[PDB]
Design a protein around this nucleic acid. Structure first.
Ligand SMILES: [Mg+2]
Ligand SMILES: [Mg+2]
Ligand SMILES: [Mg+2]
Ligand SMILES: [Mg+2]
Ligand SMILES: [Mg+2]
Ligand SMILES: [Mg+2]
Ligand SMILES: [Mg+2]
Ligand SMILES: [Mg+2]
Ligand SMILES: [Mg+2]
Ligand SMILES: [Mg+2]
Ligand SMILES: [Mg+2]
Ligand SMILES: [Mg+2]
Ligand SMILES: [Mg+2]
Ligand SMILES: [Mg+2]
Ligand SMILES: [Mg+2]
Ligand SMILES: [Mg+2]
Ligand SMILES: [Mg+2]
Ligand SMILES: [Mg+2]
Ligand SMILES: [Mg+2]
Ligand SMILES: [Zn+2]
Lengths: 135, 71, 213, 74, 39, 81, 103
RNA sequence: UGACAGACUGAGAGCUCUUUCUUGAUUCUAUGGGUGGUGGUGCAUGGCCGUUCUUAGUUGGUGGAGCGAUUUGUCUGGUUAAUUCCGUUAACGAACGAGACCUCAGCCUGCUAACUAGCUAUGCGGAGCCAUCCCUCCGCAGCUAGCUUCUUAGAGGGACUAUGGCCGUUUAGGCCACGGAAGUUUGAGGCAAUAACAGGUCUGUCAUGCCCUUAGAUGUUCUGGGCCGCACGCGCGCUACACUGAUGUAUUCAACGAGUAUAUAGCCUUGGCCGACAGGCCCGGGUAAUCUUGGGAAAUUUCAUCGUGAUGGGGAUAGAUCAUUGCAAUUGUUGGUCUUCAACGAGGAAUGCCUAGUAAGCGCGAGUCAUCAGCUCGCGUUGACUACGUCCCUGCCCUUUGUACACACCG
């Protein structure tokens, strides 16, 4: 299944799935937002939203009940403060919330009582289907 | 540097004198014997005193020796 | 509701504050310790001193006052906090009482060396392994000097210092300056527990004599 | 679990090695576990024995176990 | 607006765990409170 | 010190019932517990009774412990009792 | 008639705590009660590092102070009166006894 | 004694004045005397700390030598990290320091246990699939455990140089080696002698002598300013000078700690929604192995973009603007957004720290704290080069020796 495929080629395969599998909405700020306070430029690849989606539905598929203030820590990283020492900074909550809301508006994941987000039965199904098709 | 100090050396000789018969040439049994005859405040002190008594018996079983007076 | 960390820290702070109080009142009384034992519904606070009559006073008016004010300051439930007055088993093996004695002799005007050897001899006659008395300050002169009086066994490094040494520091407000008294007392091995520590010195050996049959 | 990436890899190494030794100990044979023990312990003695090396604590007067703050005289 | 409970001083105050003592009074009373020097 | 007769009256009645008293050093606390007064007067009339040895004082390291004395109980009885 | 009684003990000294902790367990072993304990919880070390000098001169040297706090739990099934019969023996100084009723 | 309206005032200080209500022996006036003082003096002191001093050193009793100061003991030699030990011996017998000791880390499928730690099996739930079962990956619940390996913390055990070889009075010891978790005292700390310093601290202490002041105050409190000012010299540092890299994806592995009734949701904050960020609103947990937090850290790994260019290295200086904390942010508290793109091309003479999970690299926690960490104290992560010596330089210990030094060669 998903743990038998390398997580790089799998995310490439899934992020190609959501592309040619129907569609989802895409905000009217996707081309301008940096995805993190500490980032320097927006994501280099124009097809990053889908990557960020395919990489992100694998998080809920291997875990259970992850909020947004946990995804911000997931995709946060090192922030360099110029002449002061660098520290750890969290990414932006707007993209994190929006991709989950879209996965809801496709039925891959759903919000969870007791808080958090959980993979759906059908969302589990297509992830293992696509996993079956990765070299 | 593993020089044994005065307490260990003195106690080793002075326990050799009192019980020559109940000691032997094995370290471990000598450990137990020394635990059955004297009151020491650390396991490391016991292991050190028993280690100095065991080769003292090896050289006693070899030949003569200084101040300890075996009957 | 209070956590465990803050509970234990407050307990220790209470004991520190209480003792640093009770060393002001029971000064010319031989004060020698306080112990806070907590029972259900009650907290016993055994004061111990060398002259229990003095802390008790006349028909216990002083102990009544102490109980009442300890209750009121530290917001104990009323009638929940009580004080007692035990007496130190050996006055001559406690450096708090001995330092206070020396303090009072000094402030009386007694010559320094006479008082210090008096303290020394009393501690040695009460069965202590050794004693050390340090007196420091302006003794007879404008330059400060210190005199050390020693006797018997005395150890200063390692772990047993904590359990085999009883030490006390006390100021003297003699005219024209301040004197410092340091009293160190080496206690002796007492498996009973009444007079000294139970565990022997880390370098001490006991070969049972070779019984014969 | 625990440690870092290299430390986890070495822990897993030791896990396969000691697990195989214990399996041949308890279920296969005492002689053919000696075999595999000798092949494992001729290559590297720390597929079976772990490193007692730990991170030495830090002491004041410098930022590190052994390093000290740079000293200036004038 | 935050002083040592033992001396009412304003510098080197230890507010951790709720002590509220200055760094010198805490040293003088550390053993009585129960803080042991192990290492 | 300028204190109303009512305020000192309550300081003496509370000094009566138990005989013991404490303040803190916090100056201008503005409401002593156990009795109604800004905690300045309490200190400042114990500062009088100490001078007349009606009360024996322990500075308690700047925190003010007061115990009524056999000499001052006889004075204070003729005052509110 | 049988509840779920949890008795929690805290101390600064290991041995004085473990004496009482064993005493309770054995006092509840004579009554053929279900004693699920003692459960040991991670020692909490309260640490304060302070400069030795009062005046800031010389080598900067520190002393690290520590309070170890130990947390034991004993589990019982009984009525609160039988346990109060048991947790009424002589308790060493410094030990906290804080019996409650779990859900 | 308290107070209205204007002046007085920064002031809504009845401070002071115009006006006369209010209040009653608490006050006022002088003498005396106390009191306060982060006032002076650390060269009057106490306590504490640092250093001499990281080394092995120090001292009585009795006896010996000397007129005496003094000396021996406390030593020729071997040995030790050690005034450690063997031994020698006008000394014998002892006291401290070293060691022992205590803390942490290292081993234990052995003991005690554990629903506030989990692993295992079985059941039900999902998803894949030669599909019906089996197989794999997760979820969930218990009277599953002949469960405690992993986690926690208690009791103990374990190493003693024990065994072997060689060197050595073939003593004390030393080197080598199998074994072993471990064979530098296993590693790292805590503790730590005599004698001393005119070392630092009166600005920690209602610790303190003396002096000074004590009302027109050096007391206390309020308001505002400074402590941060800037031609310049110095010390600890942070960021770098790039490709063994920067940027942008994907990927994802720790430990030590922390969480005051914190007001009526409040300290740490999960979860949901709004927002590009900053930040906000709502429903909540936790006084805690229970909730934050299996602490989903960074360096690192991965695939792209850059291409030897003061470049996309570097991020100083500065403009505009938003938000947060706080009673108040101005000489910007701090955090965001866009813009501005300085020196710096691996650094002269000099100089510091370092011998293994160490140096160095990387981030995290706590202290300070309403807000502010380039600091300090800890913690894990990645993990080497070199040496296994010497007394050349800087010093230290012991002996012999010279001395016109004794405040002692800074003589
Ligand atoms: Mg860096
Ligand atoms: Mg002032
Ligand atoms: Mg001085
Ligand atoms: Mg001094
Ligand atoms: Mg002599
Ligand atoms: Mg003589
Ligand atoms: Mg003579
Ligand atoms: Mg050591
Ligand atoms: Mg001082
Ligand atoms: Mg001001
Ligand atoms: Mg420095
Ligand atoms: Mg850049
Ligand atoms: Mg990168
Ligand atoms: Mg500031
Ligand atoms: Mg901080
Ligand atoms: Mg600082
Ligand atoms: Mg000459
Ligand atoms: Mg001369
Ligand atoms: Mg010269
Ligand atoms: Zn203080």
């Amino acid at each position: 299944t998903v743990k038998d495929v390398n997580p790089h080629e799998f995310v490439k395969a899934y992020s190609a799935h959501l592309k040619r599998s129907g569609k989802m909405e895409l905000p009217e700020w996707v081309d301008i937002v940096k995805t993190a306070r500490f980032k320097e430029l927006p994501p280099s690849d124009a097809d990053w939203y889908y990557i960020r989606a395919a990489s992100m539905a694998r998080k809920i598929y291997l875990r259970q009940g992850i909020g947004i203030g946990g995804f911000q820590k997931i995709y946060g990283g090192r922030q360099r403060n110029g002449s002061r020492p660098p520290h750890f900074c969290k990414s932006s909550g707007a993209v994190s919330r929006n991709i989950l809301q879209e996965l809801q508006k496709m039925g891959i994941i759903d919000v969870d009582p007791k808080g958090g987000r959980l993979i759906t039965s059908q969302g589990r199904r297509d992830l293992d289907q696509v996993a079956g098709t990765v070299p | 540097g593993r020089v044994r100090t005065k307490t260990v050396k003195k106690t080793s000789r002075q326990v050799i004198e009192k019980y020559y018969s109940r000691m032997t040439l094995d370290f471990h049994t000598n450990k137990k014997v020394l635990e059955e005859v004297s009151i020491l405040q650390s396991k490391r002190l016991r292991n050190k005193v028993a280690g100095f008594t065991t080769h003292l018996m090896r050289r006693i079983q070899r030949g003569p020796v200084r101040g300890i007076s075996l009957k | 509701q209070i956590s465990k960390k803050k509970k234990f820290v407050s307990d220790g702070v209470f004991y520190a504050e209480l003792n640093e109080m009770l060393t002001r009142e029971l000064a010319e009384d031989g004060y020698s310790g306080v112990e806070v034992r907590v029972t259900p519904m009650r907290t016993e606070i055994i004061i111990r001193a060398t002259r229990t009559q003095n802390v008790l006073g006349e028909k216990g008016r002083r102990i009544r006052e102490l109980t009442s004010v300890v209750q009121k300051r530290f917001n104990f439930l009323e009638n929940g906090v009580e004080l007692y007055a035990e007496k130190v088993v050996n006055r001559g093996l406690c450096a708090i009482a001995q330092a206070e004695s020396l303090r009072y002799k000094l402030l009386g005007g007694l010559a320094v060396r006479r008082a210090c050897y008096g303290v020394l001899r009393f501690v040695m006659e009460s069965g202590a392994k050794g004693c050390e008395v340090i007196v420091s300050g302006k003794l007879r002169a404008q330059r400060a000097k210190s005199m050390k009086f020693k006797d018997g066994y005395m150890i200063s490094s390692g772990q047993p210092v904590n359990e085999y040494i009883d030490a006390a520091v006390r100021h003297v407000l003699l005219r024209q300056g301040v004197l410092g008294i340091k009293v160190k007392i080496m206690l002796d091995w007492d498996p009973k527990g009444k007079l000294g520590p139970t565990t022997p010195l880390p370098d001490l050996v006991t070969i049972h004599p070779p019984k014969e049959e | 679990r625990g440690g870092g990436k290299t430390s986890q890899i070495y822990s897993i190494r030791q896990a396969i090695a000691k697990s195989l030794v214990a399996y041949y100990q308890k279920y296969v044979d005492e002689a053919a576990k000696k075999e595999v023990k000798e092949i494992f312990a001729r290559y590297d003695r720390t597929l079976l024995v772990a490193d007692p090396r730990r991170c030495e604590p830090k002491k004041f007067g410098g930022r590190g176990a052994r390093a000290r703050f740079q000293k200036s005289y004038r | 607006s935050r002083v040592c409970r033992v001396c009412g001083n304003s510098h080197g105050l230890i507010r951790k765990y709720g002590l509220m003592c200055c760094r010198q009074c805490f040293r003088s009373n550390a053993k009585d409170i129960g803080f042991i020097k192990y290492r | 010190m300028i204190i109303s007769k009512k305020n000192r009256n309550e300081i003496c009645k509370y000094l009566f019932q138990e005989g013991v008293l404490y303040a803190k050093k916090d100056y201008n606390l503005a409401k002593h517990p156990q009795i109604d007064v800004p905690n300045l007067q309490v200190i400042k009339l114990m500062q009088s009774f100490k001078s007349k040895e009606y009360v024996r004082e322990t500075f308690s390291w700047q925190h003010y412990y007061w115990y009524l004395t056999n000499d001052g109980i006889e004075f204070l009885r003729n005052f509110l009792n | 008639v049988q509840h779920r009684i949890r008795i929690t003990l805290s101390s600064k000294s290991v041995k004085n705590l473990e004496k009482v902790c064993s005493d309770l367990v054995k006092g509840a072993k004579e009554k053929q009660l279900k004693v699920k304990g003692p459960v040991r919880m991670p020692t909490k070390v309260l640490n304060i590092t302070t400069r030795k000098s009062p005046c800031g001169e010389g080598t900067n040297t520190w002393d690290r102070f520590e309070m170890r706090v130990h947390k034991r739990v004993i589990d019982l099934v009984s009525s609160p009166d039988v346990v109060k019969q048991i947790t009424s023996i002589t308790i060493e100084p410094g030990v906290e006894v804080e019996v409650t009723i779990s859900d």
